[PDB]
Amino acid sequence: EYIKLKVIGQDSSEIHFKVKMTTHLKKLKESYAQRQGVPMNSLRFLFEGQRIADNHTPKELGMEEEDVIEVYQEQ
C-alpha cells in the first residue's frame, strides 16, 4: 500500500510524496532535500512534532493518507 504525505517547508511550500507503507522515510528525506537543494543533515523532519528517524516507516508511525510532515532547520 502507498499513501500520499504532504511535506510542509519552513516557508509554507508543499511537496507531496507517494510512499509505500514499508519504505524507510530516509528516502523521502533525501528526495525532499535534493529538491530543495540543501544537505539532508541541515533539516529535521517531524510528524506530530516528533522526529522522523531514517528507519521509520509510515506503518511504524501510524501515518495515513494526506498526513502532514513538517520540515524545520536542524538544531
Binding site: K4, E14, H16, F17, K20, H24, K26, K27, S31, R35
Partner: peptide
C-alpha cells in the same frame, strides 16, 4: 505554485 507529487520507489 502547482501541485507536486513525487513517487518514492521501493528500492533502497
Amino acid at each position: 505554485a502547482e501541485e507536486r507529487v513525487v513517487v518514492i520507489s521501493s528500492s533502497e
